[PDB]
Design brief:
Elements: H1 22-25, H2 46-58, H3 67-76, H4 91-106, H5 115-128, H6 156-161, H7 176-188, H8 201-207, H9 221-225, H10 230-241, H11 247-250
Helix pairs in contact: 2-3, 2-5, 3-4, 7-8
Region (Interacts with target acceptor peptide in protein substrate): 71-73
Site (Interacts with target acceptor peptide in protein substrate): 141
Glycosylation sites: 90, 94
Length: 273
Amino acid sequence: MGSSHHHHHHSSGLVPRGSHSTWVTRTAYSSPSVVLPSQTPDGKLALIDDFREAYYWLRMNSDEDSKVAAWWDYGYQIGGMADRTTLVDNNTWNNTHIAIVGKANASPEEKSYEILKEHDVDYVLVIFGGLIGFGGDDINKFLWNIRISEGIWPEEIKERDFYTAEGEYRVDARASETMRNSLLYKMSYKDFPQLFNGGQATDRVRQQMITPLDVPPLDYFDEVFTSENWNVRIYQLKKDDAQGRTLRDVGELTRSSTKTRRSIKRPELGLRV
């Protein structure tokens, strides 16, 4: 549960920067609805677009199901790495994998919000920032070749850091514990400084935030449950080792349906071998 609505800009200009700057120059992606069939702002999330295609390229698998390819299929739609096949042959397992996330939130349970756009950028930083639970993704195999090339001046990082939270470092608890928990995991990854949990309520909600997937919307609750932020990235490892483990192989394999056609079409059916 949360609430927010104040962020929207673009990218264009000639200025320096340095090493990787996508995290802040790519997160701008934005998505107040991320409803493929409608919403579709500046398709950013480059650092994530390449991470999705890269994994879907080495694990594509195919077979009209995209088991381990579905999880990344969400980004393969454009694969900022070196594909961007416009989900032409993946639209089947791409439109049903990206629609579920935007359907669960709008479904009869929580409510359509920006939690969908924050999850996409959160899942990437959670799978690349921990690879399972802090440590693992110390390097990437497949990904864009450009590798940084200047862009929107450092106005997003300076404007996102200008904030100093509620106050010094007290009283952050209270009703805020719940109104901050959702605004802490989404601000800690977008801004950096956050996800501290005030009083004793915010901390309790952070540990209990993980949970399996009670609600029926396993597309809106599971997206943040595995993306959320450093909070979920750390709880995912302990949760995947104890309570759960296929949470990633259950939401990706669900894209299954048929076989021999997408590309693995045996030398007779698809007539392509």
